[PDB]
Amino acid sequence: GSSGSSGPRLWEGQDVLARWTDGLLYLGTIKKVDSAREVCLVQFEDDSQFLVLWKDISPAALSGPSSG
Secondary structure, three states: OOOOOOOOOOOOOOEEEEEOOOOOEEEEEEEEEEOOOOEEEEEEOOOEEEEEEOOOEEOOOOOOOOOO
């Protein structure tokens, strides 16, 4: 029971976490979203705006581990 559906949104203005060459996740803000190259231009606290792939980007949970 599965069909073609988009999971991630990575819409403009979505708080996400962009990984770094080191491996850890960094705080990034979805500035742009390109479907053609399937990427998303994220910005860093250092006014650093670049093109971050869709896979490279990591989901940032707001609430947390929903228990219950």
